[PDB]
Amino acid sequence: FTSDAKDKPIGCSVAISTYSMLGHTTKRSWEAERVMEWLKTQEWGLMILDEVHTIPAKMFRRVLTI
DNA sequence: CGGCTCGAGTGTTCGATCGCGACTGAGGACGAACGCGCCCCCACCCCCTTTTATAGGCGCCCTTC
């Protein structure tokens, strides 16, 4: 979903994203909406996290929300 | 002793710039198919000699104006 790819948006759940840095206000309206809606339907597995000792608690709230 | 107001340094897609390359039509230069025609090889059968007997056609050379 990141680095401008969008390889097979429907038909697979194993993806490599970047936490929740893809959710800008107004500038990213319908872009982040299709990513959040289509993810809660065909994916709900493991939340693989790496290097979380520098990420604040504000970003963690948007991860479990989307 | 407790809250709140600038500055400096990161992160991230995504607004804004402008070089290079795909597509397609016209012009210049070179190679291939097929073009021309002297030279050369094989096959068929003409050229040339001599002696006998006859005689028309016509060239060469002594002599005269």
UniProtKB/Swiss-Prot annotation:
The TFIIH core complex from patient XP11BE (a patient with XP/CS who has a C-terminal splice-site frameshift from residue 741 in this protein) reconstitutes in vitro transcription about 30% less well than wild-type but does not restore NER in vitro or in vivo. The XP11BE TFIIH complex has all the subunits in the same stoichiometry as wild-type. Purified mutant protein has very weak 3'-5' helicase and ATPase activities. In another paper the mutant protein has wild-type 3'-5' helicase activity. The mutation is recessive to wild-type. This is General transcription and DNA repair factor IIH helicase/translocase subunit XPB. Dephosphorylation reactivates the 5'-excision step. Phosphorylation has no effect on transcription or the 3'-5' helicase activity. A motif (DEVH box) lies at residues 50-53. It is found in: Nucleus. Changing K27Q: In a breast cancer sample; somatic mutation. It comes from the Eukaryota. Belongs to the helicase family. RAD25/XPB subfamily. It is linked to Xeroderma pigmentosum complementation group B: An autosomal recessive pigmentary skin disorder characterized by solar hypersensitivity of the skin, high predisposition for developing cancers on areas exposed to sunlight and, in some cases, neurological abnormalities. The skin develops marked freckling and other pigmentation abnormalities. Some XP-B patients present features of Cockayne syndrome, including cachectic dwarfism, pigmentary retinopathy, ataxia, decreased nerve conduction velocities. Trichothiodystrophy 2, photosensitive: A form of trichothiodystrophy, an autosomal recessive disease characterized by sulfur-deficient brittle hair and multisystem variable abnormalities. The spectrum of clinical features varies from mild disease with only hair involvement to severe disease with cutaneous, neurologic and profound developmental defects. Ichthyosis, intellectual and developmental disabilities, decreased fertility, abnormal characteristics at birth, ocular abnormalities, short stature, and infections are common manifestations. It comes from Homo sapiens (Human). Component of the 7-subunit TFIIH core complex composed of XPB/ERCC3, XPD/ERCC2, GTF2H1, GTF2H2, GTF2H3, GTF2H4 and GTF2H5, which is active in NER. The core complex associates with the 3-subunit CDK-activating kinase (CAK) module composed of CCNH/cyclin H, CDK7 and MNAT1 to form the 10-subunit holoenzyme (holo-TFIIH) active in transcription. Interacts with PUF60. Interacts with ATF7IP. Interacts with KAT2A; leading to KAT2A recruitment to promoters and acetylation of histones. (Microbial infection) Interacts with Epstein-Barr virus EBNA2. ATP-dependent 3'-5' DNA helicase/translocase. Binds dsDNA rather than ssDNA, unzipping it in a translocase rather than classical helicase activity. Component of the general transcription and DNA repair factor IIH (TFIIH) core complex. When complexed to CDK-activating kinase (CAK), involved in RNA transcription by RNA polymerase II. The ATPase activity of XPB/ERCC3, but not its helicase activity, is required for DNA opening; it may wrap around the damaged DNA wedging it open, causing localized melting that allows XPD/ERCC2 helicase to anchor.
